[PDB]
Amino acid sequence: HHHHHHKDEVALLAAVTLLGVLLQAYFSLQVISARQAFRVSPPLTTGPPEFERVYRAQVNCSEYFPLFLATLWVAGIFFHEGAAALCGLVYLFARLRYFQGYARSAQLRLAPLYASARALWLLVALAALGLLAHFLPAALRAALLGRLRT
Amino acid sequence: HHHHHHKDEVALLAAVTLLGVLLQAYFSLQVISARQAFRVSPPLTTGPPEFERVYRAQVNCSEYFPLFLATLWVAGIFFHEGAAALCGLVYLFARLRYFQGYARSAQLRLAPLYASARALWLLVALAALGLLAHFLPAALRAALLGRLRT
Amino acid sequence: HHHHHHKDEVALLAAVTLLGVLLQAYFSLQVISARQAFRVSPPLTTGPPEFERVYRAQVNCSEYFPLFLATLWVAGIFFHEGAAALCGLVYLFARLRYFQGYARSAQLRLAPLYASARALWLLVALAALGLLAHFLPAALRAALLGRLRT
Amino acid sequence: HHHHHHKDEVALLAAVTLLGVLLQAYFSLQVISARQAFRVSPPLTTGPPEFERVYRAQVNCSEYFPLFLATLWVAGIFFHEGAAALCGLVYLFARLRYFQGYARSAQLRLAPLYASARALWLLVALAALGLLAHFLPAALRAALLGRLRT
Amino acid sequence: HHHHHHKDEVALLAAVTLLGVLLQAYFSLQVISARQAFRVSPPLTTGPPEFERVYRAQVNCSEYFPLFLATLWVAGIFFHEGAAALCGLVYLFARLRYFQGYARSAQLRLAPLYASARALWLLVALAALGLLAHFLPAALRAALLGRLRT
Amino acid sequence: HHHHHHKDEVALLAAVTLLGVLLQAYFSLQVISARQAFRVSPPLTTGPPEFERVYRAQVNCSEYFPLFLATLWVAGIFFHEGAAALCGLVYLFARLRYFQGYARSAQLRLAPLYASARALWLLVALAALGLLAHFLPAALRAALLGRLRT
Amino acid sequence: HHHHHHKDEVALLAAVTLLGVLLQAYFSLQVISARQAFRVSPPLTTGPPEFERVYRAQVNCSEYFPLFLATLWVAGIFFHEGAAALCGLVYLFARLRYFQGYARSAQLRLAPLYASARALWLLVALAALGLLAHFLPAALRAALLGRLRT
Amino acid sequence: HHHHHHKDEVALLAAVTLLGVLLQAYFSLQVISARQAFRVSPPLTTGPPEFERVYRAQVNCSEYFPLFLATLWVAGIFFHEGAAALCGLVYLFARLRYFQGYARSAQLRLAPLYASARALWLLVALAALGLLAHFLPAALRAALLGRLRT
Amino acid sequence: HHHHHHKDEVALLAAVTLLGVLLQAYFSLQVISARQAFRVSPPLTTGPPEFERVYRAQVNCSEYFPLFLATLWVAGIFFHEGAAALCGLVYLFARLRYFQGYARSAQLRLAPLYASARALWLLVALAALGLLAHFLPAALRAALLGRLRT
Amino acid sequence: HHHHHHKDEVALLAAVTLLGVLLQAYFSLQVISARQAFRVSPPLTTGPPEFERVYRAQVNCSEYFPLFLATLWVAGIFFHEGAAALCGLVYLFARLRYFQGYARSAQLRLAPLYASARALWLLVALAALGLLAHFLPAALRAALLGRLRT
Amino acid sequence: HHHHHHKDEVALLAAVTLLGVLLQAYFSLQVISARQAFRVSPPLTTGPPEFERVYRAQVNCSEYFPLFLATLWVAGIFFHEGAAALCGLVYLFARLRYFQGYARSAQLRLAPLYASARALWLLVALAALGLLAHFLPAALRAALLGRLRT
Amino acid sequence: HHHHHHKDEVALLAAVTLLGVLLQAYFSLQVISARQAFRVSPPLTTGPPEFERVYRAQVNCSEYFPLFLATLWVAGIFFHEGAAALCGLVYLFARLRYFQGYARSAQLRLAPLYASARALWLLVALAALGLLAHFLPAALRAALLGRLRT
């Protein structure tokens, strides 16, 4: 405190962030479950293809999760909160489908992997466009001021 | 600048965040050390069970680390900073114990894994409760206003 | 809204964050490419050393990426934005070199790994120094006030 | 010779038989092609999953091919030639789809495997019904004649 | 059509043929069942000895099945239909016992393998004797006619 | 019975069929012999290359055997019995050479594999030409009758 | 010495003991022989299933041999010498059959394994019954004497 | 017979011996059970770590069992029956704990392994002390008698 | 008690027995030491040949140890105590040499293995000769008494 | 210098030597090429049979190359330069054929291996015959001179 | 003897030859050392990549060593002694660097491998040029004399 | 020609060289023989330890053979022919013993390996001493002449 809160500017991003965490928790619980079913004890991460697909689907989602969080917040702050949150939901729903598909079949990971890549690339473009709108005017002005005497 | 800083609202979260990073650095240095001791050179991540346990303990802590960070910040902003920071410390101390236990024995990972899951689930619940307190009143009001003419 | 934005206080951190994401995207696309070249289909993450090095270089960069993001933001907020952003650029350029080197040879990962560790440790020290400057004066004052009657 | 030919009673069965052979030839040429692509030389029948799927799809089609031929001819002679030939075409088209699907993905073999099983079971039932119509009347008559004095 | 059918000359052969197909169907369903029980997914044909024995028993029966069909029909047409059908039943019952025995133990395959070989060799001898009775008289006559002038 | 036999129309096909069976029996006895020599007990089908070549040569001959039988009978009935029987003998002699060559060396399988493929493709073409001669005239007539009013 | 010998009280146990040793010697000589035949040199204890079965049959007999000796002597001293010696002979003859069966086939070990377990359990029960007869009367008397005043 | 029995001098040793046998029987039944659960058929003694731990725990107990029996009897006869029997019970209870611990985790074998070693070493020391008391006086006397003339 | 002890009749056997136990303890401590040196953790019993030789030497000594104990006691009681004890010492010294040799080289196990076999076979022959002297006179007398009337 | 050169006595040997070196260079370049084609990177010398055959053919030629050089020079100096050079050319041409054959097929190495062995054995015999002509006369003379007085 | 020595014409070649031998001795001692460090006992030539690189570097140097010696002597005799000796030193220094580099990293073998190939190819060209100068004039003269009458 | 031969100065070196070649031929024939006995076909160089020891013993002798030849000739020319030839015989006899020993046991290679190293090091020292005697006087003279004016 402060007699103002910036919570109302990031609450959709925070909600989509928490949903992402819950989805990652779900993937982790499904791996523990596959370990039980296929009797693959730590420290092993190999076993039958069906176990390896569940393990790998979770590990893939986990590798991309910080990329998702980073670009969600940057796009949400610099471009538009609602648009970023919406691309974020689409990304997470695609990730659920990727995990479910990949667990059934390596080939079934591909369609939802492409949908998740499209949603993440869109977050990347919105983040980039917002950062450009932030930096470009001051930079072009400073260049122009430089050329002004001449 | 700005003639105000929101640093004083997130400094415990930032301190617990930095402690988390230092702990992850420690786990990484312990893997490099196990590589030396067991002569397992990159790109290999397999070798004797004792090397694999150290590798896996670090990789597990690393997978969950962004989940920890995400929920720490959301709970700290939307619920209560001190409570979030405290659950965060408990989580990180549990993770230290998980890493140390798992390195000695797969079975010794389990008790501290459960303690870390309890602390992370508590962060999740506090984040959820704070987001509910943020969104629910405006939503119930809007629903009611809708029903008002009738 | 709010009639003020804290965007101007974190825009360099956000830009370096987005660059980090783009670099991680690049590493991921290079793994997909190595999968094609060496015919290593998911769920496999093993194959010839040359494939394993590309896979491992990406996975290593990915493990450290949240540590990078965490300390970049904490150092940028609590110490100095421009200094944090600069150490961050140096870190990311070192990571590019690590990935390129490791793909050619395990041994070629080492020099740029050390440069990335130096840049990350510097971010850690700046974050720590900023948090100390935040907390230490109030703590020493409170200790002193305690001793004052005596 | 003979001043009659029974060719006109089995020409659809013979045509569907020849189509089956051509389809098996196709599967064999696709395995030779996969051997070239994946550099798997005889006597090896193992290699990457993608090679093994092509090999296995052909071997599976080959195991069932004599079952197909046997029941096609028995159903065609004892039940109805056109019906047997039609179930036979459906079976072979399902087998093409099984081979193509299985080569892409183990999971993609399943739908067309079920369609081929339905067509083969139908040939089995028609063969059984025709053999029953052949044998049952004489058998029931002989049983009855036996009971007649009494 | 034709105002005569040759169905009555091959109906026992066709019935024994259909029984052979049903038995091969049974072996195939037992392999699918062993895949489920031992979690061996296609394209794999290896796993624990107990799975491999079920797989191999089916594959062995399948390799010999066209030899069985070929000699059943040739012996049934050229020697005697009832005798061929009877040796055929004995062969198929021996094959059932081979499959059941081999699934329990490699060693238990041997006694019924020998009984199936005896029944198949008998079909071979009957086929050979019928073909000799078909060709030998005309050949000896033609040789004699050749020697007749001299 | 019947006061006529169609045996005299298929006796060369039946003789070549029986020779094919005897040749497959020979290949099977040679595998049992290689099992003894190299001490490879069922359910194993792997061992030294020299055992695997004998196993594979037999399995290859067995996969193609129903294709051989099918096309031999269709070409023999629809095209010309003596021509089909002759291509059939050539095919079987090529298969003997394939088995003997492959057992000595993978590379030695190739020349006789090509000779067997040429003989089998010739049977396929004769079968196709006979089926065309059977079906084409009635089909062209029916098409023409259709066009006749116009 | 002593002007008495307790040899006459244990000579059947000693004879059955010596027979057990000779049988274990036989099993050991058969393993050395299997090593020669299958060319499996120490320190290896793995090789083809046929070698492993001979090795394992001997190792199993060896693990149970001290259990046999212990219970033979305890039953022979505390229950009845002739009965213990007789169960002991039955056990050893069952063990010979177990070794011979297991060497031929894993499955053939089972019937004689069960017969050896029945004979060993009988020795266990006789030993237990003899020890009960030894200890129970004095214990029940001491309990009763305790209750006597009351 | 004999009008005396030495049964009363060894009945505690015999009872502890029989308990040892029953405990070894228990370990063996637990291995058979682990074979069923993990589908590891003889002659295999390898499989998942969880099966191998149960197998190894039993094999370890079995290797030491004759050492236990030997020293139990020697200490019980030459030192003191009750003391030997008591160390023996402690040893066997420690072995139960070793088996149960090792089955859960390799690391959990260690504490009860040390307790079993302490109890076995104590039996060894009591056996040694009893044998010294038996042999030393006569030996020192004989040495002294030798020195006596001088 | 008893006013006599049979300790003086078996004290050399008991001493040689205890020495055997101490030697087995030594072999076990050397395996634990090889586990440390070669980093082979339980439940593994495989690793480099040098570890496997130490493991196997101990396991071999352990398998034969109950055979040694059994025949030592039977020969010592039924033939001559001092002779049995002496063959026993020779056997144990040969076993020490076997363990030391085998640890250095598989081939170095052979000479001392043969010396241990000679000493054990001698114990076997002395045990057999003592049991014959025990049983043969009464048996020949009983046979003769049977023949006496005639 | 010297006002004479012994170059004219060994120039054919030197030319055949240089040709041998060029041929070994060729074999080495073909291995580097096979490494590229089959993606087998150093330090690996294993991979598909087709790579291993190229590697092994070169390594075999390399092992025998010093034997070739040694005997070429000794035969060329002690027997006859032109004859040695000619056997040497024949040997090298046989080695080219061995390398080319072995690369295609293990079996194709054999005929040219035998031709190279014949040429090398001939060089050996010429070297031996030349050394005999050098040493035998002086030795027989010295023996004779020894016998001369007598 | 001889009242002249050709030692002064080859002493630099002999010195460079001896240096080559000493360098090969060094490589061999470094392999023995790597065997000790990585516990890889003969007959094994495989182990961790770091051991395999040391082994392979030595084996590669050894394969090329006779090519080096052959061309060093031929170039030194037929072209120029000092030039050959100098290229030889350069080659050997490059080989030292190849061995040292390859031991650290496969990739580090490449630069010095290329330098050694350049020095060896230069020796080859000098040897070829010297042999041409030896043979070409007499050959061109003989061809010309042949053409002279015409 | 030349009216002198330098054959009489190198005939012992040539004879020892030829003996070395014959010994290498023997080692090669023994490997071909081990391939037959253990059924290890090219391109394989792995199999049971007993085959690998024969292979490795030959390959080791082959690697050192050019070192032997080089130093034999240099020591024989620059130091003393008879001494070099004698060390050479000793070396070759040691190599025979190394091959024979290593084939029986890895450990048995060591004593004769050391004897061969001593003989080869002696050849190295004699070669070095002869080259020093060749070069040192002229070098010291040239240095002295340089210092002479001063």
Ligand SMILES: N[C@H](CCC(=O)N[C@@H](CS)C(=O)NCC(=O)O)C(=O)O
């Ligand atoms: N290096 C030996 C020498 C014995 C030899 O030269 N064998 C001939 C006939 S089996 C061969 O072609 N060896 C094949 C190879 O060296 O890869 C070997 O491994 O075989």
Ligand SMILES: CCCCCC/C=C\CCCCCCCC(=O)O
């Ligand atoms: C747990 C998930 C929370 C969901 C957060 C998003 C809630 C509603 C998002 C929709 C906002 C859309 C704003 C309009 C964007 C546009 O114009 O495209």
Ligand SMILES: CCCCCC/C=C\CCCCCCCC(=O)O
């Ligand atoms: C590096 C670690 C920094 C530690 C950050 C936390 C410092 C004190 C945390 C305690 C705050 C507790 C506030 C009260 C919460 C409650 O009522 O439960």
Ligand SMILES: CCCCCC/C=C\CCCCCCCC(=O)O
């Ligand atoms: C995509 C990358 C964006 C780059 C963000 C950084 C842009 C300029 C950074 C330089 C700021 C340096 C401020 C001075 C720091 C110092 O004094 O050391």
Ligand SMILES: CCCCCC/C=C\CCCCCCCC(=O)O
């Ligand atoms: C190569 C393929 C040849 C095709 C053989 C079949 C040609 C036409 C088949 C259709 C006949 C259908 C007859 C009617 C059967 C019914 O009433 O269901």
Ligand SMILES: CCCCCC/C=C\CCCCCCCC(=O)O
């Ligand atoms: C599904 C199985 C159908 C059974 C076909 C056979 C039915 C009866 C076969 C017996 C015919 C025997 C004829 C006599 C042969 C002989 O004399 O040996």
Ligand SMILES: CCCCCC/C=C\CCCCCCCC(=O)O
């Ligand atoms: C066991 C093998 C039986 C052999 C069957 C064939 C017997 C003779 C076949 C030759 C018939 C050739 C007829 C002429 C064909 C043509 O004109 O090309």
Ligand SMILES: CCCCCC/C=C\CCCCCCCC(=O)O
């Ligand atoms: C080498 C083997 C020695 C055999 C030892 C046993 C000799 C005879 C044993 C039979 C004794 C049976 C006594 C009667 C037991 C009963 O009543 O059941």
Ligand SMILES: CCCCCC/C=C\CCCCCCCC(=O)O
């Ligand atoms: C099946 C187990 C049987 C148990 C055997 C032991 C029964 C009681 C043992 C206790 C005897 C203790 C005697 C005193 C020893 C001492 O003074 O320390």
Ligand SMILES: CCCCCC/C=C\CCCCCCCC(=O)O
């Ligand atoms: C720990 C080892 C204890 C040693 C036990 C043996 C002590 C002396 C044994 C020698 C007794 C020899 C008696 C004579 C035997 C004979 O005549 O051959």
Ligand SMILES: CCCCCC/C=C\CCCCCCCC(=O)O
């Ligand atoms: C690069 C290769 C150089 C070739 C060296 C040989 C050149 C000609 C060799 C033939 C000399 C033959 C002399 C006659 C030998 C004989 O009588 O058999």
Ligand SMILES: CCCCCC/C=C\CCCCCCCC(=O)O
């Ligand atoms: C152990 C190494 C011995 C070194 C042998 C070489 C000693 C000096 C070599 C230099 C000779 C160079 C002669 C000039 C060659 C040229 O003109 O290029």
Ligand SMILES: CCCCCC/C=C\CCCCCCCC(=O)O
């Ligand atoms: C095939 C082997 C040929 C043997 C070559 C050597 C023949 C005799 C060598 C002995 C010469 C010894 C000369 C004396 C050396 C010295 O004084 O030590």
Ligand code: NI
């Ligand atoms: Ni205020």
Ligand code: NI
């Ligand atoms: Ni201001």
Ligand code: NI
């Ligand atoms: Ni603000």
